[PDB]
Amino acid sequence: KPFTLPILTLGELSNSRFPVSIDQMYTSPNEVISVQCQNGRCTLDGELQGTTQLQVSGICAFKGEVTAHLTLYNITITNLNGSPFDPSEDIPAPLGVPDFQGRVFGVITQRDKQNAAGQSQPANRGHDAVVPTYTAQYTPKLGQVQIGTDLKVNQPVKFTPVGLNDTEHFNQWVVPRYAGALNLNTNLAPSVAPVFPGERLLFFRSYLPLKGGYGNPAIDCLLPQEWVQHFYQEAAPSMSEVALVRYINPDTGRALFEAKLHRAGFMTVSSNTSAPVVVPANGYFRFDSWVNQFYSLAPM
């Protein structure tokens, strides 16, 4: 089966590491030469990796049960489908959980498991919450995270992400210790990097909302969520380690620039600057052909 990309403009692409629309394509800073994010990870032949799952509503979201009220609550997390999480499962953590250090802001909602006498429907409550992912309390692989905001113990919760609380401790390329400092992370999607001098990573960037403070925080993903979804659907065999892709202006049919789309599921370009890529609104990538690591990209 021939490999393809979905046909989607930048305005039709979603971030795979936070559930928001893409704002820009962006070339990696000089300091960012290797990354190992765990959401938005998928091989070109459709194998999801890391903590990647298919639903936008799963990205940086989680479900679980409140086990303790301390402003702070301990949550025993489940899989997103509500089934109990088995730490023995060969994934880094429940699929969808945040893959970066930061203070994730969203809303925790709670619907009671049973109805009160005289009520035909369950009681509900919900509150703003912060989920720190850089502290020892963030141990989703051990089945527990801590949130700060009442909430009932042993009643199920949903966390809907909105943005970051603030930029304190926001390091998008530092993978959390999913099982705490005593345990190595396991079953990680591998690190990716340019290996051709003068190439750098090409990111799909979103500027996340903030609850407060100064900032315009960026989260960069390797693949849009729709690309992950498409690759999984097609399951097209990869015929080499590198797919040459070109960004097309559809009304002219001309290629504006070219990029390497690597088998592991990430892109590199030939560029000397870290900056937003300025492109027409109607443009999109198209698969050209399979090449190899020695192929030299035209400067963009």
Author numbering: 225 to 294, 299 to 377, 382 to 532
How is this structure described in the published paper?
The norovirus genome contains three open reading frames (ORF1 to 3), where ORF1 encodes the nonstructural proteins, ORF2 encodes the capsid protein (VP1), and ORF3 encodes a minor structural protein (VP2). The S domain forms a scaffold surrounding the viral RNA, whereas the P domain contains the determinants of strain diversity and recognition of attachment factors. There is considerable antigenic drift among human noroviruses, and new genetic variants evolve every other year, which can result in new epidemics worldwide. It is well known that human noroviruses bind with various specificities to histo-blood group antigens (HBGAs), which are present in saliva, on the surface of epithelial cells, and in mucosal secretions. To elucidate the constraints on non-HBGA binders from a structural perspective, we determined the X-ray crystal structures of the capsid-protruding domains (P domains) of two GII.1 (HV and noro485) nonbinders and one GII.2 (SMV) HBGA nonbinder.
Similarly, a GII.2 strain, termed Snow Mountain virus (SMV), also failed to bind synthetic HBGAs but weakly bound HBGA B type in saliva. In contrast, SMV infections of human volunteers were shown to be independent of the blood type. HV, noro485, and SMV P domains diffracted to 1.86, 1.50, and 1.60 Å resolutions, respectively. Compared to the P domains of HV and noro485, that of SMV contained an insertion loop (SMV numbering; Ala345 to Ala351) in the P2 subdomain, which was also observed in a GII. In the HV and SMV P domains, we found two loop regions with disordered residues in the P2 subdomain, i.e., no discernible electron density, which suggested a certain degree of flexibility in these loops. In the HV P domain, Pro295 to Asp296 and Glu372 to Asp375 were disordered, while in the SMV P domain, residues Gln295 to Asp298 and Trp378 to Asp381 were disordered. The equivalent residues in the HV P domain were Cys345, Arg346, Asp375, and Gly438; in noro485, they were Cys345, Arg346, Asp375, and Gly438; and in SMV, they were Asn352, Arg353, Asp382, and Gly445. In the noro485 and SMV structures, Asp375 and Asp382, respectively, were pointing ~180° away from the fucose, whereas in the HV structure, Asp375 was missing because of the lack of electron density. In HV and SMV, loop B could not be modeled into the structures because of the lack of electron density. However, our new data indicate that Asp375 in HV, Asp375 in noro485, and Asp382 in SMV are unable to participate in the stabilization of the fucose moiety of HBGAs because of their flexibility or suboptimal orientation.
